[PDB]
Amino acid sequence: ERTYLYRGRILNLALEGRYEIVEHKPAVAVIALREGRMLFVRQMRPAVGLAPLEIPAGLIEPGEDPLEAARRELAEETGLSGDLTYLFSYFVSPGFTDEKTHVFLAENLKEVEAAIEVVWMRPEEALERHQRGEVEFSATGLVGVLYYHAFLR
Amino acid sequence: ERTYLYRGRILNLALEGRYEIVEHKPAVAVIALREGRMLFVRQMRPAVGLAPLEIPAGLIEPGEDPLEAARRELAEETGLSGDLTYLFSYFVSPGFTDEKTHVFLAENLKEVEAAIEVVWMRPEEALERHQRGEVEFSATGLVGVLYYHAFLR
């Protein structure tokens, strides 16, 4: 049984016996390569007090499925559309939250539309800047970089 | 300025203006290969109501640095010790929490010690079971699988 301590906009906090649980909407993230650059985004993230390197990502809204949310986030954050393929999903931190992220690949990007900074960057370069302490990653940014190195070279 | 709504054992819930923020201890995770198998673990995770495929992981305790926490978690969860190398870090979900995960590689594993299920499994097989819907991943499990495919074949 869950007891709710807080019902919010983007999360709920519950207790389930001794466990502290944060309920959170599911998310999507989009991996996109063009001319050897990966599409990263950065924005201020008050939770961490900095702007980590992320890939385009967002919450799934009411009525939407993951593919539709992925299309919307890509367009809203970067002005692009592409051919989207589902890759895999993961729980961001299942020791305390149910947030699940669905990850897509986007191909054949086109500008559909001309706060969030678009940062095209070679993944090799993102990984080197991170190893040197120059940038932090979100899980989505790291998953994009590792996926590229595994499968897209 | 943060306003605190809840101060807990493994998180705090705060408001920072319009943002809902969950403070959380930093974590470590350990990627380990032996004879082509990756060291996964599974445990029931009440937040998600299932046991996703993870790698050995845990919270950094008071007094510890990430390397020490990684050594401890590996031993406590799997009875093993190894030669540990720092790889990279990521924020699990920086749109709402400050949880940061430090990821290590372990080599030359040895049994130091004879709830958490140890699951040695080829990463190729973990990825195929996940694509087929048979298992879910945590971020740490997916990062382990992608890192292997990128760098350890």
Ligand SMILES: Nc1ncnc2c1ncn2[C@@H]1O[C@H](COP(=O)(O)OP(=O)(O)OC[C@H]2O[C@H](O)[C@H](O)[C@@H]2O)[C@@H](O)[C@H]1O
């Ligand atoms: N939700 C909870 N609330 C209260 N206490 C808990 C909770 N979960 C576990 N405990 C207690 O806290 C102790 C913590 O066990 P350790 O191995 O250091 O951590 P980990 O594996 O949980 O988390 C490691 C990362 O992996 C996952 O992605 C997580 O989300 C983290 O990001 C447990 O024995 C319980 O006593």
Ligand SMILES: Nc1ncnc2c1ncn2[C@@H]1O[C@H](COP(=O)(O)OP(=O)(O)OC[C@H]2O[C@H](O)[C@H](O)[C@@H]2O)[C@@H](O)[C@H]1O
């Ligand atoms: N902590 C917050 N609390 C309140 N509202 C917020 C918060 N953060 C953003 N908003 C509002 O909610 C809207 C959400 O913007 P969208 O693009 O769909 O989501 P995303 O990119 O934030 O999160 C995507 C994933 O990436 C990260 O890993 C996250 O942790 C997620 O896992 C914002 O415009 C704000 O109005």
Ligand SMILES: [Mn+2]
């Ligand atoms: Mn977003």
Ligand SMILES: [Mn+2]
């Ligand atoms: Mn957005």
Ligand SMILES: [Mn+2]
């Ligand atoms: Mn912009």
Ligand SMILES: [Mn+2]
């Ligand atoms: Mn653990």
Ligand SMILES: [Mn+2]
């Ligand atoms: Mn443990």
Ligand SMILES: [Mn+2]
């Ligand atoms: Mn066990």
